[PDB]
Design a protein around this nucleic acid. Structure first.
Ligand SMILES: CN[C@@H]1[C@@H](O)[C@@H](O[C@@H]2[C@@H](O)[C@H](O[C@H]3O[C@H]([C@@H](C)O)[C@@H](O)[C@H](O)[C@H]3N)[C@@H](N)C[C@H]2N)OC[C@]1(C)O
Ligand SMILES: CN[C@@H]1[C@@H](O)[C@@H](O[C@@H]2[C@@H](O)[C@H](O[C@H]3O[C@H]([C@@H](C)O)[C@@H](O)[C@H](O)[C@H]3N)[C@@H](N)C[C@H]2N)OC[C@]1(C)O
Lengths: 150, 129, 143
RNA sequence: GAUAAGGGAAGUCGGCAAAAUAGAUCCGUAACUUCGGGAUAAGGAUUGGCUCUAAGGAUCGGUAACGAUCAACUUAGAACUGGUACGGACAAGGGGAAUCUGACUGUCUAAUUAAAACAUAGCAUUG
RNA sequence: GGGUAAACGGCGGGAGUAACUAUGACUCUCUUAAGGUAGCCAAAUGCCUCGUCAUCUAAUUAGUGACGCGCAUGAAUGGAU
RNA sequence: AGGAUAGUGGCCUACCAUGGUUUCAACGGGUAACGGGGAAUAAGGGUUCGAUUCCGGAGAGGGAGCCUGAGAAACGGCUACCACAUCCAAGGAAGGCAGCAGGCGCGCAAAUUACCCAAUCCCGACACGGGGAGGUAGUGACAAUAAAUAACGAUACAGGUUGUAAUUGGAAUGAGUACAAUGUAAAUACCUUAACGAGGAACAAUUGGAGGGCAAGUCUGGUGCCAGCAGCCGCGGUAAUUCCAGCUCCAAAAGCGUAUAUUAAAGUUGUUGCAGUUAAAAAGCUCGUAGUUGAACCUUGGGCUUGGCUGGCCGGUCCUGGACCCAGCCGAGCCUUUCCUUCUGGCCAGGACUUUUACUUUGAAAAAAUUAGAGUGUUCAAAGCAGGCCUUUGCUCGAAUAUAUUAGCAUGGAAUAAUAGAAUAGGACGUUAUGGUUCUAUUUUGUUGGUUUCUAGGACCAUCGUAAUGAUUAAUAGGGACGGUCGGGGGUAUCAGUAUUCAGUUGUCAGAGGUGAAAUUCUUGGAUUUACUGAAGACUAACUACUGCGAAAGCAUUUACCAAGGACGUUUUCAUUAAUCAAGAACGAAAGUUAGGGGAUCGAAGAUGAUCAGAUACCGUCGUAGUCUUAACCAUAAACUAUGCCGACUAGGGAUCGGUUGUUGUUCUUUUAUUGACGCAAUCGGCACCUUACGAGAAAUCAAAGUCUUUGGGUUCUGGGGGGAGUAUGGUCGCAAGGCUGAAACUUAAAGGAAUUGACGGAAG
RNA sequence: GAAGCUGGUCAAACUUGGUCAUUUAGAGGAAGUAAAAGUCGUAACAAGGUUUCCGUAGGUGAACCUGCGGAAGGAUCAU
RNA sequence: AACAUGUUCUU
């Protein structure tokens, strides 16, 4: 594991066996959906919406209680981000690294890490284009990337 | 990365067998793995085996009875014509009187003697003796 | 495992890899470079005729101590100058300057034989008659 | 100031003097190199006259991709034609292979020496 | 008494020695402030000298490439390109 | 669009467009390259060869152009040039053997200027003519088949019923010469045969060997490390089983040896099937495109009816025969929510539609010759495709069969591996749903030609209605977020520390320094030493470890800031996004290069004192570059774990670093919590270690270097005896130094690895 | 209807120049290999008498020496 | 502190 490192960590979430909501869950699918929409409109990524639901609303999984994953529900209400969240975060990290690099030209380790980050950006964008999530001519560019995360 | 679940399954079986174990865990499971195990079990080379559901690829526990000398895959799954089964049997099996080359044919996964009875051929999949 | 590709669609890699590595095989490389045709004294033949240019005695290698009786020869077909060796005690006296000898290799395929430094060919005939007959007097040298 | 059969530097200290080349279009262009050059390297072809053909615009007027009117000299091609001529006068590089030497552009012995001499940027030293 | 050569400048002789001969990697000895290094050459610097070898020619005191105990080459009195 | 062609076509022309091929290797270069059927070797997989008996192509000295003709760009046709070359009375004329035979040349390398149309077939006006095509002879140890060089008896011998060492005889025979016929176009030869044709049956067998590999001598002379032999190891220096010779023996024998090439041996080219820690060989390190390769998942079970052929029970036996039971195999059909196209005529035959592939089955067809193989006393056999029969005026079985299949064609199957589908629904069905807009077609009231709504059949739009309306897990793959951390990971400022050198201020006085011992050197102009104070550059001691971090190179004073990171935790998120990677990129110790700055210390070069036979060395004293920094270069190390990366599995043990989770006879806040440290347990990750040796290995050793002849998880790179040589040359990068790429001639029998016993050591005990 | 004439078309061949490939002469220079008993030293193998070796940079009759960084394949698996 | 060297070829 670790595409761009030699680490072999296995830490992960272990999803529970039962696919149904627990008996102590009482909120309805509509309540959870409108809660998701409320948090999304408030400015939260699907990962962070899932975190809030788990941490304060007894929602172990959106799928088990609502029948759908957070991004699918989010797309069905015209609230899916124009760039997928993981690609956006990779781009944002590249932008920050490149600002640091233009401010610190002798940081060779940061130059190496920038190469790694941008390689992941390119591989992920290739995947998103090949499944029609991104436009066919979509193409990450260092000069213009400060305008997406802007 | 994992490139052949059947290879891992049969390797784990061999490593348990040579150490004198009577049981072995397999992960992941697959339909091909189950069919290969069923062919092995039919000829008496393994005991029963039990599939463990985990809402994932599955796991299998296999019972071993000490009669297995070696099982293994052939990788690639070479295309085998009917007249080329004999060379694979000569190459892979200890003797002419026992052992099996396991094939995947359009008629299903079978040993080479069943393939010779039904006059069918496919790809080579593994062996057992 | 094993460091060679095993895929069912990997035939081109295996074929080209074998083709590259046979160049390390001396016999195959000599054959496909055409060294016998372009650089061998005989041009790739089994035998060749020549003219004797002189006589030479070559000191044998250690641990032996002798004087091997050899002639300097220029071949008819290409004018190359080669050193040949005459077998059989009493046959340097059967060869003279400006005689036409027929040569052959020593059987070691272009290598030197025995204790004889830097000599690759053996005289077979002189003036149209074989050394074996002249040694055994079955025939006499025509002059 | 011109021309000269055949030869073509045999003349001479020495090709001195003269000759030869020359415009433009198209083609093609080596070693070496400080990569900028060398280069018009070298070496080839074309060029007249006439009769045509095509391309390249401006201003008005509502699929105007159109009409009307106007207007400049460039470029490319074809037919024909002559004592095979034609950058027809004029104007207008000879070229190549090397050695010595100074890097280069620049400067001086007005009135016998223009150079390899002086200068130069670069480099170093001194107060 | 000390320093300083991109200050002026300077930068060695005599003998012997290898299993054909020749040559001398090697040795002995005298001697300087230091004994001419890297390079380069019969060069605009070599007397002997039209040096010797090669090339160029029918024929070359010319040219060019080599060689170098160099009368008297040689490192910012700058060396070699 | 034309022209030309027998005709398509950039085949050519005019105008127009800017296209066509390529790392899945184009284009270019080499070929000691005509292709194929085939050949040699062959456990299997392979390797090598194919000018040449058949098929296809091409050429007639080189090039080109044509005539004639159905057909030629013909050469035993023409025309021209080039090159060769014949004659000539000098004006001219005539040529093409890579047809047959023959000459010259070339070379290691290959045959007669013979006879004939009798067979094979071909041509012509042709029953008849012609055929160096073809057939027959000559030369012919290319290869292949069969196969003489002898045999049988007796004497005394020899010996334990014959197997016996010699010389005594009777015979037999074809090698060859030759009456005759045959054979044949005529011959020759074979086959058949009068007269001939063997005791040393002289009608006389050879080629290589006798140390080992490898079968067969330590016999006699000669030589004396010479001459010679010897594939390799070796023999030979005065007792040579190896040379030179004589005797004996061995092997194969009408054949045996040598040279070169190739095949097996070679698992020493490795797909099957090699090796890469140390023998040759893991790229310094990551990123990355092509290539190769990539988790799991969707009709599984159950029942009924039934065909065949397998064994025995009937057994029914003449090896073999029928209904019944038993089981076994290859099959079909129905039913289970049910795949398996769909209509017409009415289990076939004409319509309307079909998601694409790989793979496997079967078949059509695939020249003879060759291969494998059935039949045949060519007297055998190699071969050939014949031959056999009461002996005829005839009769007769034959001229088998498989092998071929990469590609194409047809066909059964639906495992394996792909591909498509309904997500802003632009989705599926409505058979005889409903409405609207278009088309076409049979059919008239038969007299011609008509109207255009019903109507038959496509195609669309709208409405409505059926429906279980439609989205697989989330991989102890991967990516992303989130939380508290942890690091001598990186960068920029900043801040310590002593020490070193030097400078100032003092103080005393005779040496100091340096070494194995000294000398060079510094010193009464005060050295060294002592105290106080200052200035510069480096460096970061102790703490400091079988400890941490980073891709590797590397990284160690404080503080602040900047951006990254692993691991852990997580009932967060995306859903295959991945692994390894030619090309191509980033970084890369030290030294080295360029330009500024700094230059304490050590210190290549250099200077100098010793030592020494000499030391331009080690040791001492100085000291330039360098050492440091900022901008650029350079790209290499024993850049090492001499050990590619990803993934799974296989055995015991105690420690340790990071995270998290449960738990004290402990010390401490504070008397106690949510203090902290320590102690006890679990767990994931990491740097390691100890034992074992199931296993691996040549061993040393190895928890991987195991799961490898019981040989296949994915993938990249590298090696193929030692040298020449990482050299030469071409290319390329670099300011240079050099880096990268990278041969060949030639040479050579070992070089090398790991271990053992000894010996030796200016090694230890 | 012959010779001949015009213009085309295919185009041998010759000259010049260019380029590609393959052989090959050459003063002199610099290597490699081979060859019983020539010279000079003694670098390596033992702590080989300065442990050896790698990269880089200078120096030197020759092996080689020295500086900086690295390795153990060390003469230390250890206080 | 110093300590360099050992013709060729075997049996
Ligand atoms: C001059 N000797 C060469 C030696 O250099 C080497 O050649 C390689 C050659 O094998 C490589 O190339 C080889 O492998 C590539 C592969 C990448 O696909 C193939 O495409 C190519 O056809 C093949 N010849 C080439 N890329 C570099 C040469 N130096 O090996 C072959 C050789 C003839 O011995
Ligand atoms: C080990 N280094 C050696 C060096 O010592 C020297 O060795 C010579 C060697 O070449 C000589 O030997 C040489 O020359 C002789 C003869 C022609 O003199 C030949 O017979 C011999 O085969 C040949 N090797 C030998 N006789 C003395 C050694 N010191 O030769 C050069 C060298 C290779 O660097």
């Amino acid at each position: 594991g670790r595409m761009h490192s030699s680490g072999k960590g296995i830490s992960s979430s272990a999803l529970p066996y039962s696919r149904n909501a627990p008996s102590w869950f009482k909120l309805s699918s509509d309540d959870v959906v409108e809660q998701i929409i409320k948090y999304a409109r408030k400015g939260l990524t699907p990962s962070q919406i899932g975190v809030i639901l788990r941490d304060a609303h007894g929602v172990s999984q959106a799928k088990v209680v609502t029948g759908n994953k957070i991004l699918r529900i989010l797309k069905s209400n015209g609230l899916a981000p124009e760039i997928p969240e993981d690609l956006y975060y990779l781009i944002k990290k590249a932008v920050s690294v490149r600002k640091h690099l233009e401010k610190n030209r002798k940081d060779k380790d940061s130059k190496f890490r920038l190469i790694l980050i941008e390689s992941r950006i390119h591989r992920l964008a290739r995947y998103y284009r090949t499944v029609a999530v991104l436009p066919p001519n979509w193409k990450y560019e260092s000069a213009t990337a400060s305008a997406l995360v802007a | 990365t994992r490139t052949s679940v059947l290879a891992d399954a049969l390797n784990a079986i061999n490593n348990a067998e040579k150490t004198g174990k009577r049981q072995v865990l397999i992960r992941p499971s697959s339909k091909v793995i189950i069919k290969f195990l069923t062919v092995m079990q039919k000829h008496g080379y393994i005991g029963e085996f039990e599939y463990i559901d985990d809402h994932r690829s599955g796991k299998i526990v296999v019972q071993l009875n000490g009669r297995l000398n070696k099982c293994g895959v052939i990788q690639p799954r070479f295309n085998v014509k009917i007249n080329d089964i004999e060379r694979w049997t000569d190459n892979l099996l200890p003797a002419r009187q026992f052992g099996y080359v396991i094939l995947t044919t359009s008629a299903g996964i079978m040993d080479h003697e069943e393939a010779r009875r039904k006059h069918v051929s496919g790809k080579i999949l593994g062996f057992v003796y | 495992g094993k460091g060679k590709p095993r895929g069912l669609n990997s035939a081109r890699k295996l074929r080209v890899h074998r083709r590259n590595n046979r160049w390390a095989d001396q016999a195959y490389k000599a054959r496909l470079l055409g060294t016998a045709f372009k650089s061998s004294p005989f041009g790739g033949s089994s035998h060749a005729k020549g003219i004797v240019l002189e006589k030479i005695g070559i000191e044998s290698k250690q641990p032996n101590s002798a004087i091997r009786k050899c002639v300097r020869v220029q071949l008819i077909k290409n004018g190359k100058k080669v050193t040949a060796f005459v077998p059989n005690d009493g046959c340097l006296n059967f060869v003279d300057e400006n005689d036409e000898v027929l040569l052959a290799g020593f059987g070691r395929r272009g290598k030197a034989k025995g204790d004889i430094p830097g000599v690759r060919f053996k005289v077979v005939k002189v003036s149209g008659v074989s050394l074996l007959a002249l040694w055994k007097e079955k025939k006499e040298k025509p002059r």
